[PDB]
Amino acid sequence: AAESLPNIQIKSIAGITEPTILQYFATLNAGEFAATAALFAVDGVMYPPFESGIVGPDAIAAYLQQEAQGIKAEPQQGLAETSEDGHTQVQVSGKAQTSWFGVNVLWLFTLNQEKQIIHTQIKLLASPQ
């Protein structure tokens, strides 16, 4: 039963190989929001668009279950850079979308030395000109 193909098949996409970033999008898109929340540090912060920051895996999981239904993430490219303090700064561009409409966005992440998410934000990007 459990001995079978797993979930969240982690495939490198969006030009980023950071495991935590690949797992974030894979778990989100499978609706495995507990697993998404578990990628955050004990005091990691998720900033939903237009909302106050949500702190910690338990509150993040509950937010995603209540508010992220029917939203798929489609990353197209990304870049990760490691700073002097040992953290990793990630940018990912792509689309957030439903079955028939969506929006261009930028996902931003900062990871700690253990590669947990310390905080993430989503920024909107209107279509050109």
Next chain:
Amino acid sequence: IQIKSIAGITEPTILQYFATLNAGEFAATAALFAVDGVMYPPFESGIVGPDAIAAYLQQEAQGIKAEPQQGLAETSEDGHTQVQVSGKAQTSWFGVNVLWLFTLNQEKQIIHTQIKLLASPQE
């Protein structure tokens, strides 16, 4: 005395924007814009055209530096380029984390730019 930076954007117009800003060469910053390109300062109305953009920067951007860190770019089918650069706007000794958004036309002139403030705290 203009000095380039380092990030995920090799685009000359983008590199030039930050270098001319940091040098206080605000007429040259403004010249990177199209004749009807628009600059949106963080909480302000759009300023249209190199003449108005140069005068705004000379008035309100003195002593402000840009330290871009990394960026992404996408080109659409019509030939426009969208650029996102994250970094800090800062003075000699204090700053804030920001995201610069640009749209470039086919000729790589700035059509649009704006600044978005990013999160600084930890509640």
